[PDB]
Amino acid sequence: LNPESADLRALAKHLYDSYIKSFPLTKAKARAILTGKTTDKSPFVIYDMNSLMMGEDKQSKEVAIRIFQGCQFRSVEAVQEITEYAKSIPGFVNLDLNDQVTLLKYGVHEIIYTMLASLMNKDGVLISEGQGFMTREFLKSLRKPFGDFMEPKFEFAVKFNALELDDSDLAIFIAVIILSGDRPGLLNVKPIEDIQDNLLQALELQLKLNHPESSQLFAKLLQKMTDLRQIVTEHVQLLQVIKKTETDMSLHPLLQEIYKDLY
Amino acid sequence: RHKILHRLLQE
Numbered sequence: 001l002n003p004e005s006a007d008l009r010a011l012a013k014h015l016y017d018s019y020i021k022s023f024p025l026t027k028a029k030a031r032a033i034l035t036g037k038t039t040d041k042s043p044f045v046i047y048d049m050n051s052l053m054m055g056e057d058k059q060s061k062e063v064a065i066r067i068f069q070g071c072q073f074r075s076v077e078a079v080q081e082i083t084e085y086a087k088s089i090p091g092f093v094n095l096d097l098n099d100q101v102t103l104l105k106y107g108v109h110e111i112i113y114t115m116l117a118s119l120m121n122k123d124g125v126l127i128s129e130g131q132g133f134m135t136r137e138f139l140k141s142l143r144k145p146f147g148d149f150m151e152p153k154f155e156f157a158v159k160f161n162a163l164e165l166d167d168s169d170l171a172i173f174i175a176v177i178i179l180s181g182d183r184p185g186l187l188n189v190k191p192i193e194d195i196q197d198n199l200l201q202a203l204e205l206q207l208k209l210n211h212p213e214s215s216q217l218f219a220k221l222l223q224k225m226t227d228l229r230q231i232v233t234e235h236v237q238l239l240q241v242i243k244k245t246e247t248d249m250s251l252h253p254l255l256q257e258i259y260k261d262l263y
Numbered sequence: 264r265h266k267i268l269h270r271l272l273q274e
């Protein structure tokens with residue numbers, strides 16, 4: 001290790017520590033829960049309407065809506081955690097505040113679906129901080145339009161999880177996503193690109209040191225950033241459909257704010 | 264616009 005590499009290791013560590021502070025349920029813990037390698041009770045499995053209702057004992061709108069709005073509630077909490085994490089990225093809070101807002105607005109869902117993969121396997125997803133496991137099949141079975149809203153997220157996840165990143169890798173990756181200089185409407189791109197340049201260098205070194213056997217992991221990971229955007233744009237279209245067809249529902253105000261003039 | 268995010272950022 002040389003002095004520039006050292007500064008990059010320090011940045012990696014600083015981000016890892018902020019990540020652990022900001023995000024209560026890590027991929028480490030999630031994996032422990034999913035494999036069974038934990039001394040906690042295994043999670044309650046939700047695979048049908050009945051199991052759901054018995055698990056709720058751990059509103060009274062229809063099931064698909066209750067599930068969809070539980071996802072909204074989780075995002076709202078996730079946005080708060082991501083906002084706190086973003087504030088720890090060196091140089092972030094020194095940006096024009098309008099640009100901080102724009103970066104968060106466009107970054108949060110990409111990060112949400114990234115971190116959701118940490119909680120997923122090919123059969124289902126941990127919920128309620130790992131106290132539950134909701135099956136992929138059950139989510140597929142929901143009545144249209146809700147029946148296939150999770151499928152693109154699971155398909156992304158199985159591919160993304162094959163990279164076998166850990167929390168120390170994810171912490172840098174997430175910061176890279178937030179510091180994207182090509183978000184629409186940014187006022188001053190230069191200081192954002194300067195920060196992202198450093199982060200990307202930090203990520204590349206991190207991946208070389210933590211995964212020395214996995215050649216071109218850095219390049220595979222950068223291509224996923226493009227796939228995350230697709231997940232978000234498609235989701236926006238699904239939301240448009242849902243907003244037209246289900247005037248039962250109401251989007252949480254934080255989410256209205258994020259989604260307004262997003263794509 | 265972005266009243267909440269502003270708030271979370273400045274908090």
Ligand SMILES: CN(CCOc1ccc(C[C@@H]2SC(=O)NC2=O)cc1)c1ccccn1
Pocket residue numbers: 067068070071072074075076112116125126127128134239255
């Ligand atoms: C399927 N799970 C795990 C969370 O799965 C999520 C799926 C999608 C999102 C994105 C939300 S949903 C929306 O329209 N906008 C958003 O930001 C957020 C979380 C459930 C289901 C019920 C209760 C709690 N957890």
